[PDB]
Amino acid sequence: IEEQAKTFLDKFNHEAEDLFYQSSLASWNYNTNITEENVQN
């Protein structure tokens, strides 16, 4: 069960990093320029 848990964590990290980077970039864009479209994004 430890091996499959490690495999699941390895699979999760790759998918999590990209989405977190996208969300952080969206937040950075919103804070950089205050526009309603950036709010929606």
Curated annotation (Swiss-Prot):
Outcome of swapping residue 21 to R: Increases slightly the interaction with RBD domain of SARS-CoV-2 spike protein
Stretches the record annotates as Interaction with SARS-CoV spike glycoprotein: 10-21
Protein name: Angiotensin-converting enzyme 2
Biotechnology: An engeneered stable, dimeric and secreted receptor with combined mutations that increase the affinity for human coronavirus SARS-CoV-2 spike protein shows potent SARS-CoV and SARS-CoV-2 neutralization in vitro.
Subunit structure: Homodimer. Interacts with the catalytically active form of TMPRSS2. Interacts with SLC6A19; this interaction is essential for expression and function of SLC6A19 in intestine. Interacts with ITGA5:ITGB1. Interacts (via PDZ-binding motif) with NHERF1 (via PDZ domains); the interaction may enhance ACE2 membrane residence.
Effect upon mutating residue 9 to F: Increases slightly the interaction with RBD domain of SARS-CoV-2 spike protein
Induction: Up-regulated in failing heart. Expression is induced by IFNA and IFNG. Exposure to cigarette smoke increases expression in lungs. Expression is decreased in nasal and bronchial epithelium of individuals with allergy after allergen challenge. IL13 stimulation decreases expression in nasal and bronchial epithelium. (Microbial infection) In airway epithelial cells, expression is increased upon influenza A virus infection.
Family: Belongs to the peptidase M2 family.
Domain writeup: The extracellular region of the ACE2 enzyme is composed of two domains. The first is a zinc metallopeptidase domain (residues 19-611). The second domain is located at the C-terminus (residues 612-740) and is 48% identical to human collectrin.
Residues glycosylated per entry: 33
Upper taxonomic lineage: Eukaryota, Metazoa, Chordata, Craniata, Vertebrata
Effect of residue 13 to D: Increases slightly the interaction with RBD domain of SARS-CoV-2 spike protein
Gene: ACE2
Tissues and organs where the protein is expressed, per its UniProt entry: Expressed in endothelial cells from small and large arteries, and in arterial smooth muscle cells (at protein level). Expressed in enterocytes of the small intestine, Leydig cells and Sertoli cells (at protein level). Expressed in the renal proximal tubule and the small intestine (at protein level). Expressed in heart, kidney, testis, and gastrointestinal system (at protein level). In lung, expressed at low levels in some alveolar type 2 cells, the expression seems to be individual-specific (at protein level). Expressed in nasal epithelial cells (at protein level).
